[PDB]
mmCIF file of all heavy atoms in Angstrom:
data_model
loop_
_atom_site.group_PDB
_atom_site.id
_atom_site.type_symbol
_atom_site.label_atom_id
_atom_site.label_comp_id
_atom_site.label_asym_id
_atom_site.label_seq_id
_atom_site.Cartn_x
_atom_site.Cartn_y
_atom_site.Cartn_z
ATOM 1 N N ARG A 270 135.571 -228.089 -40.100
ATOM 2 C CA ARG A 270 136.706 -227.369 -40.660
ATOM 3 C C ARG A 270 137.815 -227.253 -39.624
ATOM 4 O O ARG A 270 137.580 -226.800 -38.500
ATOM 5 C CB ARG A 270 136.280 -225.981 -41.137
ATOM 6 C CG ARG A 270 137.251 -225.338 -42.105
ATOM 7 C CD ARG A 270 136.812 -223.937 -42.473
ATOM 8 N NE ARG A 270 136.727 -223.070 -41.306
ATOM 9 C CZ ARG A 270 136.356 -221.799 -41.346
ATOM 10 N NH1 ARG A 270 136.026 -221.212 -42.484
ATOM 11 N NH2 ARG A 270 136.316 -221.099 -40.217
ATOM 12 N N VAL A 271 139.021 -227.661 -40.008
ATOM 13 C CA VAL A 271 140.191 -227.617 -39.143
ATOM 14 C C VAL A 271 141.259 -226.772 -39.818
ATOM 15 O O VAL A 271 141.499 -226.906 -41.022
ATOM 16 C CB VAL A 271 140.734 -229.028 -38.835
ATOM 17 C CG1 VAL A 271 141.744 -228.967 -37.707
ATOM 18 C CG2 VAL A 271 139.599 -229.970 -38.485
ATOM 19 N N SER A 272 141.891 -225.900 -39.044
ATOM 20 C CA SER A 272 142.934 -225.019 -39.545
ATOM 21 C C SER A 272 144.306 -225.598 -39.230
ATOM 22 O O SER A 272 144.551 -226.069 -38.117
ATOM 23 C CB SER A 272 142.810 -223.627 -38.930
ATOM 24 O OG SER A 272 143.765 -222.742 -39.482
ATOM 25 N N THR A 273 145.198 -225.564 -40.222
ATOM 26 C CA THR A 273 146.581 -225.952 -39.968
ATOM 27 C C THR A 273 147.262 -224.979 -39.017
ATOM 28 O O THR A 273 148.203 -225.360 -38.312
ATOM 29 C CB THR A 273 147.359 -226.047 -41.278
ATOM 30 O OG1 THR A 273 146.913 -225.025 -42.176
ATOM 31 C CG2 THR A 273 147.142 -227.404 -41.921
ATOM 32 N N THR A 274 146.812 -223.727 -38.987
ATOM 33 C CA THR A 274 147.217 -222.785 -37.952
ATOM 34 C C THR A 274 146.443 -223.121 -36.684
ATOM 35 O O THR A 274 145.259 -222.794 -36.568
ATOM 36 C CB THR A 274 146.955 -221.348 -38.392
ATOM 37 O OG1 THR A 274 147.499 -221.140 -39.700
ATOM 38 C CG2 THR A 274 147.594 -220.371 -37.422
ATOM 39 N N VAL A 275 147.109 -223.783 -35.736
ATOM 40 C CA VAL A 275 146.413 -224.333 -34.580
ATOM 41 C C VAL A 275 145.822 -223.254 -33.684
ATOM 42 O O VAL A 275 144.868 -223.526 -32.950
ATOM 43 C CB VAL A 275 147.357 -225.249 -33.781
ATOM 44 C CG1 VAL A 275 147.885 -226.355 -34.672
ATOM 45 C CG2 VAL A 275 148.499 -224.449 -33.185
ATOM 46 N N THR A 276 146.358 -222.033 -33.720
ATOM 47 C CA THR A 276 145.811 -220.969 -32.888
ATOM 48 C C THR A 276 144.408 -220.563 -33.318
ATOM 49 O O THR A 276 143.662 -220.008 -32.506
ATOM 50 C CB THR A 276 146.729 -219.748 -32.911
ATOM 51 O OG1 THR A 276 146.712 -219.158 -34.216
ATOM 52 C CG2 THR A 276 148.150 -220.149 -32.562
ATOM 53 N N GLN A 277 144.034 -220.828 -34.569
ATOM 54 C CA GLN A 277 142.703 -220.495 -35.055
ATOM 55 C C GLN A 277 141.658 -221.540 -34.695
ATOM 56 O O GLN A 277 140.463 -221.266 -34.836
ATOM 57 C CB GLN A 277 142.729 -220.305 -36.571
ATOM 58 C CG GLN A 277 143.860 -219.428 -37.065
ATOM 59 C CD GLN A 277 143.748 -219.118 -38.540
ATOM 60 O OE1 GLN A 277 143.344 -219.964 -39.334
ATOM 61 N NE2 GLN A 277 144.109 -217.899 -38.916
ATOM 62 N N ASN A 278 142.069 -222.718 -34.243
ATOM 63 C CA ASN A 278 141.135 -223.770 -33.881
ATOM 64 C C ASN A 278 140.635 -223.574 -32.456
ATOM 65 O O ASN A 278 141.271 -222.918 -31.630
ATOM 66 C CB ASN A 278 141.787 -225.145 -34.027
ATOM 67 C CG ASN A 278 142.122 -225.480 -35.464
ATOM 68 O OD1 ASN A 278 141.333 -225.227 -36.371
ATOM 69 N ND2 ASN A 278 143.296 -226.054 -35.679
ATOM 70 N N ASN A 279 139.471 -224.156 -32.178
ATOM 71 C CA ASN A 279 138.893 -224.069 -30.845
ATOM 72 C C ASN A 279 139.752 -224.823 -29.841
ATOM 73 O O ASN A 279 140.341 -225.860 -30.155
ATOM 74 C CB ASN A 279 137.472 -224.630 -30.851
ATOM 75 C CG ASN A 279 136.715 -224.305 -29.583
ATOM 76 O OD1 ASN A 279 136.494 -225.173 -28.742
ATOM 77 N ND2 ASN A 279 136.313 -223.051 -29.439
ATOM 78 N N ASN A 280 139.821 -224.294 -28.619
ATOM 79 C CA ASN A 280 140.625 -224.896 -27.557
ATOM 80 C C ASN A 280 139.815 -225.992 -26.863
ATOM 81 O O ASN A 280 139.411 -225.888 -25.704
ATOM 82 C CB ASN A 280 141.087 -223.834 -26.571
ATOM 83 C CG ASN A 280 142.130 -224.351 -25.608
ATOM 84 O OD1 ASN A 280 141.936 -224.324 -24.394
ATOM 85 N ND2 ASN A 280 143.244 -224.826 -26.143
ATOM 86 N N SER A 281 139.580 -227.067 -27.608
ATOM 87 C CA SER A 281 138.845 -228.214 -27.091
ATOM 88 C C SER A 281 139.193 -229.430 -27.934
ATOM 89 O O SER A 281 139.757 -229.317 -29.024
ATOM 90 C CB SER A 281 137.336 -227.960 -27.093
ATOM 91 O OG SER A 281 136.819 -227.967 -28.412
#
Side-chain angles (χ1 to χ4, degrees):
Chain A
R270 198 183 60 181
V271 192
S272 184
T273 36
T274 310
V275 303
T276 68
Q277 313 187 323
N278 294 318
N279 192 253
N280 191 239
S281 72

